[PDB]
Design a binder for this molecule. Sequence first.
Ligand SMILES: [Mg+2]
Lengths: 146, 63, 292, 43, 439, 218, 233, 76, 123
Amino acid sequence: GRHGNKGVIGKILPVEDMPFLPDGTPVDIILNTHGVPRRMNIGQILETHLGWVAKAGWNIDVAAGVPDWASKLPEELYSAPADSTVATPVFDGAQEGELAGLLGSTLPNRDGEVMVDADGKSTLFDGRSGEPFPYPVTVGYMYILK
Amino acid sequence: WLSAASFQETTRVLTDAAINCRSDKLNGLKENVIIGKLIPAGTGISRYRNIQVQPTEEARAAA
Amino acid sequence: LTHKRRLSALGPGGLSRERAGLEVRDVHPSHYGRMCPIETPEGPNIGLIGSLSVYARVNPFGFIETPYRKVENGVVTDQIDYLTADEEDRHVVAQANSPTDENGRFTEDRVMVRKKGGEVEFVSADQVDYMDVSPRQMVSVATAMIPFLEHDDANRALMGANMQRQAVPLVRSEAPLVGTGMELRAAIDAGDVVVADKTGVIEEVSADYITVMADDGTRQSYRLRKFARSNHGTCANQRPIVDAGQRVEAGQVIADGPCTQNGEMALGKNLLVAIMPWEGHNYEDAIILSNR
Amino acid sequence: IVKGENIPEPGIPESFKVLLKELQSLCLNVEVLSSDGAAIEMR
Amino acid sequence: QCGLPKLMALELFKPFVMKRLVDLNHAQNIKSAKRMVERQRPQVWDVLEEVIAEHPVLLNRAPTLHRLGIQAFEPQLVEGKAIQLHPLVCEAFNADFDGDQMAVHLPLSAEAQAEARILMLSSNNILSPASGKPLAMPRLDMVTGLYYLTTLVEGATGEYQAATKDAPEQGVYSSPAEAIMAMDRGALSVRAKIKVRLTELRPPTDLEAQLFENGWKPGDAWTAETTLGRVMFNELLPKSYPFVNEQMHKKVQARIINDLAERFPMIVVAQTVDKLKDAGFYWATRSGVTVSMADVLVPPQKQEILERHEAEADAIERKYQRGALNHTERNESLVKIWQDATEEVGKALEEFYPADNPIITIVKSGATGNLTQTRTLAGMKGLVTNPKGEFIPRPIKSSFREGLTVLEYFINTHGARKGLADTALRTADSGYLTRRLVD
Amino acid sequence: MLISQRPTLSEETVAENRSRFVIEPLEPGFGYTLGNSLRRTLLSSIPGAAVTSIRIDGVLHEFTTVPGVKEDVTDIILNLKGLVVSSDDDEPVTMYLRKQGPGVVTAGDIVPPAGVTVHNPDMHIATLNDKGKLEVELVVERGRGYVPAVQNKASGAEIGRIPVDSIYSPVLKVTYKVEATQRTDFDKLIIDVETKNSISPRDALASAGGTLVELFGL
Amino acid sequence: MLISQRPTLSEETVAENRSRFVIEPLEPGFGYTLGNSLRRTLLSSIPGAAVTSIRIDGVLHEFTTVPGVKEDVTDIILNLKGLVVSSDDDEPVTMYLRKQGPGVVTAGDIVPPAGVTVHNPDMHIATLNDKGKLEVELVVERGRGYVPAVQNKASGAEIGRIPVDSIYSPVLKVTYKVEATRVEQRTDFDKLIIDVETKNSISPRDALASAGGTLVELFGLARELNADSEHIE
Amino acid sequence: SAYDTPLGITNPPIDELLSRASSKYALVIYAAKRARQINDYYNEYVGPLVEPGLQEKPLSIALREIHGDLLEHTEG
Amino acid sequence: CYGRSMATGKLVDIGEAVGIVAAQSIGEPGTQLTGGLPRVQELFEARVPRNKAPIADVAGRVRLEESDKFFKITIVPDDGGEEVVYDKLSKRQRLRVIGVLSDGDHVEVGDQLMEGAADPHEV
Ligand SMILES: [Mg+2]
C-alpha cells in the first residue's frame, strides 16, 4: 500500500474457504494484525475504513440539524452513493470525528442488512469450518499496488 | 603470511614476508580454505577424519 | 514523472557519494516548499537524492523558489510572489492554514509563523508579511499521493513514496477508491495520457488512433501507444476513454495511459481487506489472497 | 553422480594456482614445499 | 522441512534424476535423460521425489551474522516459484517475508550430507550459541495465540461456581473430552475457571506429593482447577512434564522451552515447539485480535495535562521573556517539563486501556511492540531531536492517531531521517568489526 | 430425550436467479457446519458451461488491435470473460460471431449452435465504427470450477487459437445463517443461493447434495 | 458432468476404544468442507443412552458430603458420568444402586431394569468407609449429543434431585486434520485424518458408518429437489 | 522415552546416536564412511547389516546401523 | 576451561571452533548497538580511551583539591611512601563513585579516580 506496508503473497486460497461477510462476500486479502501497530503507518487503517465508506455510500446526519462533528465541516459531502470515489488531500483530509460519523452508513448489501458497524468491523465466517470467528474483525477496502 | 595478506594491508605484508623469507606451515583454517585443504577444526581434525569403520564380526554373522 | 524533478548532489562537479557526510543528507529548514524532505532513497544515497517540491520553481540563476502569498496588516492578498531562500529568511511566513475571515483577513487572534532560523514562533497577525500558498508545499508529487499522510511516520511514508514508483501497470487499471488531490494532475503532466489541445468533437475512435474535429476547422489526430515495451519491461498500452459523438474541451483526457483510469493515476486495485491473523499463513508481513 | 558412484576426492582450486602466478609476476618467489621434497610444481 | 520450488528442485538435482530415470528404463541413454529433464516431460516428477527423499539441503539468508544463518532442512517439492520457510527459523535467519530471498545449496558427498543432517539440521539447532537462550521459540502470532489460550477470564461462560445449597458444584467435568463437548456447545469457554479430572496429564510438584507420593499418575486420575485452554496447552508439552497452569507470556514460554532443553532430548524439544506453533496459530486467529481507529484509545486527561504544562512552559518562557532566565536553562527547562508530561500521558494512557484491548494484548504478551510505540500512536509522540543532535524544545502535542500538522510533521522527519541514516552505517561498521573479530 | 421429526427442507423465492432454502429441524450446533458444507461445494463443483478458446480471423495473437474496433483484443477477451453460457455438451462445440458496420457488439450477436444458449445477451463486447469488422468464433466446453487457459503448446492447437481462462461456475454468491429452534433448543438453518442464470438455485443445490451425497460413504 | 479418481476410506486402530480414519485422495478443498461436518455428525448426531438425573439417600439440603465414603458428592457424580449403558426404553428409566457395609461399589452392583444393559461393570463409583451404606437412584433416558445438566421448572419440587451433565453419544472425543498428496499425478490433493475415541457401546467403525448414514440421507433433502446434476462413484 | 515418532531426516534421534560416538563430529565421519562403504557394495564391501528400506539412501542406512550398535569404530 | 556449549547445553565438543563462534556471538548484536560500537571498537582495538581517566597507582587515603578549571588528587600511601599526585583533571569529567569520591576516602591499587575510560595499557 501507499503507507509503506509491503509483503509477499504467502498463500492464495480458493474463494470457497476465506473469511467471508454475512452476505457470502469473500474477502480478497487478509493482512496480519501484528505488523500494523508497531510501524506507525496507521494511516493504512483509516483508508481501510474510508475505503468501505466510499464503496457502500452513506447519508447524513440530517435532519433535523447537522451533527456536531460535521460542523467543521463536510460541505455537500452529506451524501454520496455507493462506489463514489473520495479525496483527502494530505494535510487537510478527513478528520477522525468525520470518520466515525460516516462509519455508520449505509445499507444494504442488497437486502437491508448492514455489513459493517461504526467501529469498521464485521463478523467473518470461516470458509473452512463454516463457523463464525469469535470476535468482530475489521474489514474494508484498501488500495494495494503490485 | 598469506593469512595476513588476505586480511588487510596486502602490499605491506607481502613485501615484509618476501624480505624475511617467510614460510607458512598452513596450520590455520583460513590458510587451508584458500588452498582447498580441510580446515583443522570440527570434522577436519585428525582424530575424526582418520576414524576407521568396520561392522562387528557379530554383525557380519547375522548378515 | 519523479525521475525528472529529481535533484542529486552526486556527479561531476559535485561531491562523491562516499566522502560527503551526513550534514548534507539532513533536511535543512530552507528545504521547505522547495525539496521534499519525505522522499529519498533508502540505500546509502539517503539525502543525496531528492525530488523537487510541488510548487517549487527554478530561478534563472539556479536557485529554487517557492510560491508565497504576501500578507499586509493581517490581510492576505491575492498577490503571489515567488521567493528564493535568501529573501525567505528576510520575512515571516504565515502558516498555510490559519482561519480565514469573511472577505479574508486574520481571524485567529495570533498567527502561526516561520522565522529566519528557521525558528518557528507564535505572533499575532500584526508582524506577518507572507503566507504559505497551501499545505503540502514541502511535499513532492508522490508524497502528496499518500492518503492520510499526516498519520504515518516519515519512515514508512518514505517507503510508501518509493514503492508507488515501483508499481506495475495492470491490464485493467482501476483508480484508487480513496485518493488525494494529486492523482488527476500527476497523470496528465506525466505525458502517458492523451490530452486534446483544442476544443472540438471526435470524428473517429479506433484502438489505433483518435481524431478530433476542432471548432477551429483544424483536424488533430493522436496515435495510441499499444502494448509498447517499456524500459524495464512493463506495458505502456493505452485505451480510448471517449466515444465518436463526444464533445471535448481543450486539455481534456481522450485516452487512458498504462496506470491511469479516467485521467487520474491508478497504481493499483481496491481490494476487500480483513485484518485478522489467519492460521499462521499471513505472518511476519506475508499476505494471503482470494483466488478470485 | 550420473554413474551413482562415490563422490571423488577434491583437487586444487584453480584460483589458488592463479594467485601463485600473480605473485610470481611481482617478482615474489613463492614455492609450495611438501614436508619435503621441497618444491612442488603446479601443473 | 522446507518448501522447495519443484522447478528449482529439478535443476538442482538434474544429474541425480538423469541417472534415476536411466535406471528405471524411462530413458535408454544419458543423452535422452538430459532432454527428458530439460523439456520437463511429466515422468520426471515422480522420479524427483525419489532422489530428493531424505536428501538434505542448506538454506542461507544474507547477511550471515551467526552460523545459524545457514541451516539444513528436508526438502519438500512445492508448487509455485517461491520457497516455503518454517516460521520458527525466521528468528535465526532474521527473515522478513517483506520479499527477502534465500539461497539453496545442495550438499553432495556423503560427508557433506552427514554434516548437514547431524551438525546443521534445523531441529538440532534451537538455542542461540551465544546466550544459550532458545531461538526457535514461538514469537509474534504464536505468542498471542497461546497467551489467549492460557489466559483466565473472570466470569466466563461455564465458570465453576461452586454450587451451594440446592445444587452441586457445577464447574466440574468428567474428563477433558467432556469439557470439549461442553465448549462446542455454548456451555463452556476456553478461558473459564473450571476444575477437571485428568487421567493422562501430570500434576505439578507440590500437588503431586500430597495426592499420590506412592507413586505417580501414569494412568491415574486427579483433579485441579485450570482453564480448559491451559489443559490443552499442557497436552502440547511432553506427557512426562508437570502441569504449569499459567497464562503464557513470552518469558514464561522461554522459561519452559529453556527447561525442556535441560531435561529432555533435542527431538522432544523439536516436536514440542512444532506443537506450540500449530496451537498458537489456530488460537491467534480465534483470538479476535484486529486493529481499528476505534480500538485506538486516547486518554481524556491528555487535554488538561497538555494545557497544564503549556502554562508551566509559557510561564518559564515568561521568565525568559522577562530577561532574567538563562536562555539555555529555559530551553533546558522545557525539556524537563515536556519530557515529564510525556510520562503522565503514558501513565494516563496505560490506565485508560482495558486489559483485553487488541492493541495492548499484543504488547502485553510480549509478541511485538512497545509502550513507547503505543505512546506515539495515541496520546503524544513527544519531543523530537533536531539534526544537530540537540532536543527541539517544541513538542509534538498531537499523536499519529489524530494526525500531525504541517510543522509537526516537518520537524519529526528532521530527526527521523537521521536515525534511518544511522541504521545504514551501523551495519557497515558492525560488519567491519565482525571481520576483525573473526580474523 | 430423542426428538425425531425428520429434517424438513422447504424451498423459497427471492429473485429469479436466487432463492432461499430452509431445513428444520436439526440437532444443536449443526447449521453452521451443514451450511458451510453446502456453500463450499456450491462455490466450486457446480458444472458449466464455459468458453475455452476463441479465434479471430484478423489477429494471430492476443496483443494486437483490430481495425476500427474501439477495444483491443486483450480488453475484448476480458469482456468475453463475463459471458455466462450453458451447454448440454458433451464434447467441444464452436460458436460464431460476425458483425459489420458501426454499432455495438454484444452477446446477443453471438449465434450459438444447436444445444447451447447465451443467458445474458445484454453484455457489451466491442464497439465498432464504419471501418470496424469483427469475425470471431468461440469454443464452449463443459466442466466445473476454474481452469486456467490451456496453452496450445500443451494442447494440439495451431498458432491462430487464443486460449482463454475458463470459469465454469453457475453459482454467483452464497451465504447462510441459523436460528436455534431456551432449553430444548434445536437448530434450523437457511441458505441463500444465487446463480448466474445458467441454472436455478434449485438445480444447483440439487447438484451440491447429489455431489455431496455420493461423497459420504462407509 | 462428474467423474473423478479416486477416494478411499482406511482406518488405523489405536485402541479398542480409539481409531484413526483417513480418506485419500480428496479434491481440493474438500478436506475442510466435509471433515468439520463429520466431527459434528459423530459427536452430536449418534443415538445413545446416558444418565440424566440422580438422587442419593441422605443428601437433600447438604452442600457436599457423604458420611461413610471417602468420595464426596462432586467426585461421585463425575465418577458416575462415565457410566456407559445402552437403554432400550426410549423413556426415562430409574435403576437402583443400594449397598452397605465396608467395600468398594462398582457398576456391577447396580441392578439394571429389563432393557438397560451396563457396558462397564468394573467402573468405580465410591469407596465405602467401615460400617456404611449407600443408596442412589439413577435416571437414564435416551438421547443424542451432549446435553448439559437441565434444571427446567427447574429442578423444582424434587428435594435431593441432582441433575447431571449427560454425555449421550458414544464418542467422547473427536478431531480432524488436513494433509496434502500426491506425487504429482495428483498434486496438492487433500487427505483428511479423523481421530475418534469411542465408548464401549459401539466401536469406531460402527460410529463412522452411523455418521455416514445419518449424513448421507441428511443431504437427500437437497438431492430430492432434482437429482439432475451428479458426481462420480 | 516417548518423543512420539521422528519423520525422515530426524530419525534416528541425534541423542540416541550421540551415545554411540564421542561427539557430533565423530558421528559424521562414522556414518559418512559407512555410507561410502555401502555404496561400493552396491557396485569396502559389507552390509546393509540392517534390513534396507525400499529406496533407502546408504547414508540413511548407515545411521540406522549405528543406532542398533551394528558397527564399531576407532578414533584416530 | 571453555565450559558448556551454549548450543548443545553440554560440555563443548573437542572439534568446536570457539573463536569464530565468539566473533559472531559478539558482532551479530552489533546492529542493535546504538556508548556504542565506537566504545566497543575502542576496547577491542586497545586504543587510549576517548577521555582518559586516571587509576590509583598505590593504596592510601586521597587528598582532594580544586583549582580554577582543574582538580588535584593526591594519594598518601599507607606505606606511607612517596606521595602520588594527579596534576590537572578537567572538572568536565567529574569523579567516580563509591557516593562520589570525597577528600579522605581510601583507595585500593586499581581504583578509578574519575568518571571515564581507564587506559587499558595503564591498568
Ligand atoms: Mg527485508
